[PDB]
Amino acid sequence: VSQVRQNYHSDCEAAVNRMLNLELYASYTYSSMYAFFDRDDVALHNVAEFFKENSHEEREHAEKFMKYQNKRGGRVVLQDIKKPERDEWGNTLEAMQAALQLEKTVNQALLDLHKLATDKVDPHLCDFLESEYLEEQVKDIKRIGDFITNLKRLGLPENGMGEYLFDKHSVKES
Amino acid sequence: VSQVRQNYHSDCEAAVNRMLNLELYASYTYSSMYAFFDRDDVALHNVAEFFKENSHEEREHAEKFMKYQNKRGGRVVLQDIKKPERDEWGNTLEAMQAALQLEKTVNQALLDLHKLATDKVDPHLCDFLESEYLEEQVKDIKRIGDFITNLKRLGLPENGMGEYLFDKHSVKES
Amino acid sequence: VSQVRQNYHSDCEAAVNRMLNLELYASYTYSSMYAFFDRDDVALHNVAEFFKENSHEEREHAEKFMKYQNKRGGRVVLQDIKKPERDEWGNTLEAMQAALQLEKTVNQALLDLHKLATDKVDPHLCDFLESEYLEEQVKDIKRIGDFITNLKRLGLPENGMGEYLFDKHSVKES
Amino acid sequence: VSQVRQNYHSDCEAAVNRMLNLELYASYTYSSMYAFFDRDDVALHNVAEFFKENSHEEREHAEKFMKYQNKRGGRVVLQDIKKPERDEWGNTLEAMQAALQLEKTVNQALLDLHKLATDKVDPHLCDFLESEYLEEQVKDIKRIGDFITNLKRLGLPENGMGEYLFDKHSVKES
Ligand SMILES: [Cl-]
Ligand SMILES: [Cl-]
Ligand SMILES: [Cl-]
Ligand SMILES: [Cl-]
Ligand SMILES: [Cl-]
Ligand SMILES: [Cl-]
Ligand SMILES: [Cl-]
Ligand SMILES: [Cl-]
Ligand SMILES: [Cl-]
Ligand SMILES: [Cl-]
Ligand SMILES: [Cl-]
Ligand SMILES: [Cl-]
Ligand SMILES: [Cl-]
Ligand SMILES: [Cl-]
Ligand SMILES: [Cl-]
Ligand SMILES: [Cl-]
Ligand SMILES: [Cl-]
Ligand SMILES: [Cl-]
Ligand SMILES: [Cl-]
Ligand SMILES: [Cl-]
Ligand SMILES: [Cl-]
Ligand SMILES: [Cl-]
Ligand SMILES: [Cl-]
Ligand SMILES: [Cl-]
Ligand SMILES: [Cl-]
Ligand SMILES: [Cl-]
Ligand SMILES: [Cl-]
Ligand SMILES: [Cl-]
Ligand SMILES: [Cl-]
Ligand SMILES: [Cl-]
Ligand SMILES: [Cl-]
Ligand SMILES: [Cl-]
Ligand SMILES: [Cl-]
Ligand SMILES: [Cl-]
Ligand SMILES: [Cl-]
Ligand SMILES: [Cl-]
Ligand SMILES: [Cl-]
Ligand SMILES: [Cl-]
Ligand SMILES: [Cl-]
Ligand SMILES: [Cl-]
Ligand SMILES: [Mg+2]
Ligand SMILES: [Mg+2]
Ligand SMILES: [Mg+2]
Ligand SMILES: [Mg+2]
Ligand SMILES: [Mg+2]
Ligand SMILES: [Mg+2]
Ligand SMILES: [Mg+2]
Ligand SMILES: [Mg+2]
Ligand SMILES: [Mg+2]
Ligand SMILES: [Mg+2]
Ligand SMILES: [Mg+2]
Ligand SMILES: [Mg+2]
Ligand SMILES: [Mg+2]
Ligand SMILES: [Mg+2]
Ligand SMILES: [Mg+2]
Ligand SMILES: [Mg+2]
Ligand SMILES: [Mg+2]
Ligand SMILES: [Mg+2]
Ligand SMILES: [Mg+2]
Ligand SMILES: [Mg+2]
Ligand SMILES: [Mg+2]
Ligand SMILES: [Mg+2]
Ligand SMILES: [Mg+2]
Ligand SMILES: [Mg+2]
Ligand SMILES: [Mg+2]
Ligand SMILES: [Mg+2]
Ligand SMILES: [Mg+2]
Ligand SMILES: [Mg+2]
Ligand SMILES: [Mg+2]
Ligand SMILES: [Mg+2]
Ligand SMILES: [Mg+2]
Ligand SMILES: [Mg+2]
Ligand SMILES: [Mg+2]
Ligand SMILES: [Mg+2]
Ligand SMILES: [Mg+2]
Ligand SMILES: [Mg+2]
Ligand SMILES: [Mg+2]
Ligand SMILES: [Mg+2]
Ligand SMILES: [Mg+2]
Ligand SMILES: [Mg+2]
Ligand SMILES: [Mg+2]
Ligand SMILES: [Mg+2]
């Protein structure tokens, strides 16, 4: 038993390792979307940079779980980071639809981890999830939903001028 | 009944007074460790100052419970602050082992108070403990565990040079 | 064929994707070493931070290959990022020995990619490797070799005081 | 023989003069595109300025070959600068397609000069091309490819609003 460990269930320790892996998986998916929008035959550089920044934030989310695991006296166990589900992402609308689903998958895993922490009476882990993960997920889901609504209004997938304008006006200039 | 009181169970009020006392007890134990490491025949001044600062922080933790009690309309009831369990603390390793156990005793009391607040459906008290006490405890337990690991690596209790080096490099220069 | 593609052999495109994967693998190994040295029962925080920074630099190396692939008109193809070879890294000497071998594995792959680029008469890819990767590898191998020499001089693995001193004096304060 | 000449083959000297001429030809073509987009019946001033700046950069590329020739002890020999292939450039898409082909013609000549320098065992000339010309060509080809992809998305040649928007958002405001 780690000398620091107190009120930290083995099941929560394992679930934190699985959550860590899912954050790395989400990072890698966003890396793939960055590389796709940087292609010469796609060439939507502000969209590409949005996904690159998301990739970096998800890696930071994973590192924060590593630090958390060690603070509680659990032991980080790593698994392979699976490659993303697609090699090419169609267009900005298809990519944003995939991002929305990814963010809701990550959110569901965080909510499931909160349920487990509640069941094991771990208020520190509950607070960590509520204070560091759950609100950022709601905000990032809302942002992507707003983007999808605007891509549909702009006539995606058919309206190339609409796609061009989204990249200029909806995502930060990079 | 206090005019401000709302959703504040008598049992939680009493448990806050007991928690207040335990914070003052923890403060006093750290005061004792400060005075020990300041002795001419101990003379580890950065270690002494680490414990002095901890003593001040635990007193602040107690004062925050006094303020909390009054905000909720409970009534502060003080009891004697018991003297520490030891008059002398051996060496840096023995003192840090005692500090780890003290921090885990305080943490267990905070977790038990959270259980009571949960049972009495007091989300304000739950939030107060999660936001003001529980993460600071996990961080301070991790810090002391890290110190104990390093004191063991440095050959305590036998290796006086190791003890000297810990005071120079592991705790803040004071 | 990509409209930008010129003098870019399919074999080099594929080898760049494999090199990208190896950089991500190296990043992940360094992440594992960071988490290990951050454990409460290891607690060498400057060593941990050295490996964390290396993890970030290797991820940047991977991203630079993604950008390169797209500049040449190749297509990024991602594969799983395999978990590191170990779950625990022993001590600073064992970890640095593993880091030296990892850096020489990455260097050999870069040298093999340079051989392929030379065979396919691709001076742009040769210059990219020489200007962005090969000297950084020689410098980072030299740094790790110097560290191993010093860890041996400090009596690793047995001399815990030597290990403590390496973390204070050989790696940057973090 | 020039007193400075060392390891500089007559064939490389002649090929540097031909490359100089091609840079001046590329400059002149971009000058023509500037003047076309500045016409009152074309009037895409940011596109015009993009091509004007490219014209200046290609002239600088030529001057750098003149300086190189003299540094090695070769003798600059100038030939006529041929007028561009067209007197009018259609629209932004046709001009960018012509620019892509021009940049790939210049790139092929630079790669052919690198082959010759390699055959004549001239590492100074190889380094000069790799360090001063080949990466700038890959970057400028990628930029023009990205532009063509966006002009197609914006509905060129038929979509005049798309052409107008490209000039406002894709090229620098001038
Ligand atoms: Cl536990
Ligand atoms: Cl408990
Ligand atoms: Cl358990
Ligand atoms: Cl696990
Ligand atoms: Cl699997
Ligand atoms: Cl796919
Ligand atoms: Cl998903
Ligand atoms: Cl949050
Ligand atoms: Cl449409
Ligand atoms: Cl607009
Ligand atoms: Cl605007
Ligand atoms: Cl009440
Ligand atoms: Cl109520
Ligand atoms: Cl009551
Ligand atoms: Cl009481
Ligand atoms: Cl008593
Ligand atoms: Cl005693
Ligand atoms: Cl205790
Ligand atoms: Cl806290
Ligand atoms: Cl000893
Ligand atoms: Cl020292
Ligand atoms: Cl020092
Ligand atoms: Cl090719
Ligand atoms: Cl070629
Ligand atoms: Cl090929
Ligand atoms: Cl591949
Ligand atoms: Cl495999
Ligand atoms: Cl292992
Ligand atoms: Cl290896
Ligand atoms: Cl380098
Ligand atoms: Cl020893
Ligand atoms: Cl010569
Ligand atoms: Cl020679
Ligand atoms: Cl000659
Ligand atoms: Cl000539
Ligand atoms: Cl002629
Ligand atoms: Cl014409
Ligand atoms: Cl041409
Ligand atoms: Cl260059
Ligand atoms: Cl149209
Ligand atoms: Mg132990
Ligand atoms: Mg377990
Ligand atoms: Mg999973
Ligand atoms: Mg995340
Ligand atoms: Mg698979
Ligand atoms: Mg919050
Ligand atoms: Mg954010
Ligand atoms: Mg996000
Ligand atoms: Mg918004
Ligand atoms: Mg369309
Ligand atoms: Mg009253
Ligand atoms: Mg009462
Ligand atoms: Mg008590
Ligand atoms: Mg306290
Ligand atoms: Mg007594
Ligand atoms: Mg907090
Ligand atoms: Mg603190
Ligand atoms: Mg404390
Ligand atoms: Mg620390
Ligand atoms: Mg001794
Ligand atoms: Mg095409
Ligand atoms: Mg191929
Ligand atoms: Mg591989
Ligand atoms: Mg690398
Ligand atoms: Mg495996
Ligand atoms: Mg070379
Ligand atoms: Mg070079
Ligand atoms: Mg260099
Ligand atoms: Mg460096
Ligand atoms: Mg490195
Ligand atoms: Mg050095
Ligand atoms: Mg030993
Ligand atoms: Mg002479
Ligand atoms: Mg001659
Ligand atoms: Mg010519
Ligand atoms: Mg040129
Ligand atoms: Mg003629
Ligand atoms: Mg360069
Ligand atoms: Mg430039
Ligand atoms: Mg150019
Ligand atoms: Mg660009
Ligand atoms: Mg029209």
UniProtKB/Swiss-Prot annotation, chains A, B, C, D:
Residue stretches making up the Ferritin-like diiron domain: 6-155
Family annotation (Gene3D superfamilies): 1.20.1260.10
Reaction equations catalysed: 4 Fe(2+) + O2 + 4 H(+) = 4 Fe(3+) + 2 H2O
EC top class named in words: oxidoreductase
Keywords on record: Iron, Iron storage, Metal-binding, Oxidoreductase
Amino acids binding Fe cation 1: 23, 58, 61
MF annotations from Gene Ontology: ferric iron binding; ferrous iron binding; ferroxidase activity
GO BP term, example: iron ion transport
CDD domains reported for this sequence: Ferritin (cd00904)
GO cellular component, one term: cytoplasm
EC number(s) reported in the record: 1.16.3.1
Binding site for Fe cation 2: 58, 103, 137, 140
Superkingdom assignment: Eukaryota
Record function comment: Stores iron in a soluble, non-toxic, readily available form. Important for iron homeostasis. Has ferroxidase activity. Iron is taken up in the ferrous form and deposited as ferric hydroxides after oxidation.
Known partners and oligomeric status: Oligomer of 24 subunits. The functional molecule is roughly spherical and contains a central cavity into which the polymeric mineral iron core is deposited.
Note: There are three types of ferritin subunits in amphibia: L, M and H chains. M and H chains are fast mineralizing; the L chain is very slow mineralizing.
Family: Belongs to the ferritin family.
PANTHER family in alphabetical order: FERRITIN
Protein name: Ferritin, middle subunit
Organism: Aquarana catesbeiana (American bullfrog)
